[PDB]
Amino acid sequence: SQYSIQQSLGNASGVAVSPINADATLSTGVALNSSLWAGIGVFARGKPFTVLAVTESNYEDVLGEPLKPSSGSQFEPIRHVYEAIQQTSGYVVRAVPDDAKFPIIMFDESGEPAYSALPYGSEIELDSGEAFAIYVDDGDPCISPTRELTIETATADSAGNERFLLKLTQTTSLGV
Amino acid sequence: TRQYPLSRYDDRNIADPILRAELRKEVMLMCESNDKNLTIYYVLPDEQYRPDLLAYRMWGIAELRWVVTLAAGLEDESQGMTVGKKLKLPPATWIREMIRHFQYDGQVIGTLSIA
Amino acid sequence: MQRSWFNHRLTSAKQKSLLYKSLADLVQSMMDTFVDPWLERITNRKSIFSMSKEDLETRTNELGQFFTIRTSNSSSVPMLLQQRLDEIHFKGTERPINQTIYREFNGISVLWDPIYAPVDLERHPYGTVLIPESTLETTGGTFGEMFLTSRGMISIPINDLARTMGITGTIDQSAITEEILRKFNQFVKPLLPLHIVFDGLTLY
Amino acid sequence: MSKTTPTKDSIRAEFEELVEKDSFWSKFVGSQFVSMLTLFITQIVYRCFQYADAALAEGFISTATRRSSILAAAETNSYVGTKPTPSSGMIEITATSEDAPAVIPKNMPLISDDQYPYMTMDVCRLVDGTGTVEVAQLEIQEVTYTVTAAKEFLEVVLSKALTAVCYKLEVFVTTDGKTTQWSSSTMFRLAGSKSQVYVEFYKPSEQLGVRFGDGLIGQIPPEGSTITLKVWCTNGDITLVAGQNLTPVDSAANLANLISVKTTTPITAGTDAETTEITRNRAQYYLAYDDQVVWGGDYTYFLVRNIPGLSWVKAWGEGQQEKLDGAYNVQNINKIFISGWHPNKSQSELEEMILAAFKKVPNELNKKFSYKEVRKLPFKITITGRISASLTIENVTDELKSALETKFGRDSTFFDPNRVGKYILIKKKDVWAFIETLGYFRDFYLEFVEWNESNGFYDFVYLDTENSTFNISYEEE
Amino acid sequence: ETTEITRNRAQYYLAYDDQVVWGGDYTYFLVRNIPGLSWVKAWGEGQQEKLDGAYNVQNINKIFISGWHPNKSQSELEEMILAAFKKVPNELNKKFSYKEVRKLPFKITITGRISASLTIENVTDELKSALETKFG
Amino acid sequence: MSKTTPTKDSIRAEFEELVEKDSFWSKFVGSQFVSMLTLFITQIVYRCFQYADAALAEGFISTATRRSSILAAAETNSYVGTKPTPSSGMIEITATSEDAPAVIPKNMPLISDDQYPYMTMDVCRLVDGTGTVEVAQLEIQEVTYTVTAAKEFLEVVLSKALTAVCYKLEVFVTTDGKTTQWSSSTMFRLAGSKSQVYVEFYKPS
């Protein structure tokens, strides 16, 4: 009914709202297509050594939250982007040193999982074992928040091919 | 500044529980009387918790909540009242006038014959 | 006495919120523990049989302790007071005595025997010869006309008292008589004056 | 959990362990605002508990001290109080003109100098234009109504404006021109199908009402008839100084200028309305009375209700008197001992009032009453001790004498503090408790000179205040 | 029926309770229960005492009840009285007996003349009927 | 004596001024935050207060207006109000075929156009296909109870509809195939076990 509010959307139809948590962010806007800027910075999330067309809609989302100014000299770029995106969009490029590593989970033939971490840019290969694997690429170390996956079966295709539904989610420290 | 919090709507403006009691007595008499100057309307499913929603929608004031509460005889809003029950509401100004009379000169109440 | 009562004027997200259920159930507990028992006692007061103990002895001792029976049968106390209050219309007779007997003796046959005297004051002055009605058939004939007075005694069958006292062996007649006459004094005697005169208690 | 009074610290506690045992603050620590929120709700629930205590007080007539609640309970008991009585004075009349008749007709109106209506209780006779009569503060009201619809239990309502002075009521039913004075029996007792009966009652808003029968029990007045309520009113004990002139008014104003009337006696023998607490007490004792005249307590209650002004009454049954006397006296059979004390009337006077009362009361069956005079038993009290030196010893002595006279005087209310026929005596414990409640002395001793114990039939033990001894000293501070 | 009238009926139905507390109450209830009674009246021990003018050893707690019914004899009246006494169990330490009712007729001799417009026979008939109706 | 409590706008005002004590939360006043929490606490205290007031008011005999309240008062007074009684009378019964039995017993229902059950109280004897029997609009609704416990004056209540239309009642105490009849009896008198039956009761529900 109109009184119910959900959190995630599947088959049921309803209107959802933000949960009761400790922290939240926002970023909304439309592209400029008038005059652009470029620059190198270090931020949260985002692929290393990668260009990103940043606007008011993704400034806080794909770049992560601003970091602590006393947490290294990485606060100059975040302040600059914060002051600039409020009026103009850009094509900011981000890279990190080789010390950063992204994680990966491998499902073997039986589907058993195995956790691993590899330096960014390294390519994973599959030997006789290690049936397949899935690695995260957004740049988040999966620590704040964390990435979780839930996989089960589902209805088959029109050709009768067996199908399975998997859902990805981010879980914060407080449990949202 | 000069300020005092109050509102001239409360039937419980009369501090006497017994006086409030006969007040609700005759208002019940009139409500479950079949007077035509009463409203003609049934129950709504969501009125179980909130009998005063009907008062709000058809009048904009919640002062009728005790009126409907005595009309339905509810033990608690946790319990519900049957949907479709015959409910009757008199014009509010009539209650305002009777209570005005009763709290200025509500002495004879029943019948005045001659001075 | 309310379950999830704050589940109706609240948006569902704030209902499933973490702290709103905390505040809701704490206040539900607080009202449960410190407003409702007054509602329960007033609802008990509504019904003559439902009234809580405190209310029962409150109504009991409002009039005074001399108008009641010191019984441990708390369940029958509402019933006993119902009888004590509805008997007021028929309490010029032996019915209230039997009503007292209900609890004081659990249904013992008690007979009101008025005092009988001879007419012959010279042979038997009034108040000297008091013949019970049980022997009146065979004794009062020799005394001519047989004065009847409102004064009288009360007789209890010895077999009935032995049955109700639940003792097969030694029976202390004096002790049981003293106990029952004290019960009579402290529950039944106030009903006697003025017209009713009690001048002794006897066992058949 | 319980109705026992809690403490704010206890409530704060119960709240705080509830909070810590709840896991939501565990996931959300740092709510120091809930601290003073708990404080505020603690005072809120404290006020709520005070309100609940008020609810308990008002839920019982004994605990409730409100006139409204007491009247509601009394009407449940089907009990009503007594109206105030007129105050009557003795006046002399000397007509100033020859045309004035020497016989003044019955019930001629009069006004007093203090602007109060007065009414003659009888026909005044002038001995050659000179006469004397007793006149009381009496006035007349009347209301007439006409029946228009048919309701079972015909009801009529009155206004406090007139019930505040009402003293006597008269009910006339005029059906098709035939007027009948209807009788009243309470709760429809002895009411047949067509009995000319009605019941009058109070109403917690001090309203006055009367109800009629259902046709099954009590006559139903027919449609189109009229009902007449005559109300003889008085303002109570309106006392006026003797030696003042009186002005006839209304139809008597014609002879007002022709006849001179001067009072000779202060207007006395008036009574006012009884107090709320005494009404409550009489309500409880009427609940005991059970709406029937059977026993001696009921007899005393009825007699004290019907005879204002007596200090107290006492009565003993046939069995009680026979037990006192030690004999089965046939003459004492169906004979009820009676006695009483009045602050202003002698024992013989009291006996003749009570004999007249029993004569004009027909609610008896072969009930014989024997009156004996109440015997006073004065005794002296010697209070010896030391007191605070800060007060004047003369002032302390005067205060003590006044308090003793008030408490255990010859005409003290202590003997009949409930006015329901329960005459009680003075006790040494009572005296010592009263003086300790006074608490002025630091140490003291009571000597009960010529102390005696009342028989309870007629002995009247009271303190001899004027002969009492006051060995009052100053206790060193 | 209506709530208020139901409440009133409940709170006032206690009048019909057979609460009889005096001999006058007995007489009233007997009159109201037995239609057609000419009259019923009781007389207690004091009434018999003042009737006799002297003390009676027998008139002790004894009440003599008399009455007349045109359609009933003295025996019938006593029988109905006793039946009502059983039907109403409200008494203590008082005996009730039935007292004979002694007829005391008396004649009236009227003498005079009427107007010639009247008929003597019809006037006699009407007067006799009215006198038997009112004081017969 | 008497009881009093300040009004809603008042209690809101003193509540906000007392919460204005701590400077770190004092100035939230004026916001829909404080107003919503305030209206919530005021509504809950309003419920508890005036519903206790209504309870104490209904505690009086003449103040009872609810059907349940007045029936509870009547039960306390040991009286029962005059319940509705259906009209009773005569109905003709004709036989449309030889298969129609000439005897129609009591205790059979009759369905009206509104399916109003018409109980028969006599034996209809068809004389040449024509018969008569006493008929009145009545129905018999049967329920049962099992003895849960041996509690003195154990309560057994009925539904709202049964309480509304309970024109007459019959209580059959059946034990292991043995049925006795118990009735409702008031005005208890005489010592000993006066009777082996139940007593009446009403509940303000």
UniProtKB/TrEMBL annotation, chain A:
* Top-level lineage group: Viruses
Q: Specify the protein name.
A: Gp22
Q: Which organism is it from?
A: Escherichia phage P1 (Bacteriophage P1)
Its taxonomic path starts at: Viruses, Duplodnaviria, Heunggongvirae, Uroviricota, Caudoviricetes
- What stretch of the whole protein does this chain cover? 2 to 177 of 529
TrEMBL record, chain B:
Which top-rank group of organisms is this from?
Viruses
Q: What is this protein called?
A: Gp26
**What lineage is on file?**
Viruses, Duplodnaviria, Heunggongvirae, Uroviricota, Caudoviricetes
UniProtKB/TrEMBL annotation, chain C:
User: Which superkingdom, per the lineage?
Assistant: Viruses
What this protein is called in its record is: Gp16
**What species was this sequence derived from?**
Escherichia phage P1 (Bacteriophage P1)
Residue range from the parent sequence: 1 to 204 of 278
Automatic annotation (TrEMBL), chain E:
Report the domain of life of the source organism.
Viruses
Q: What is this protein called?
A: BplA
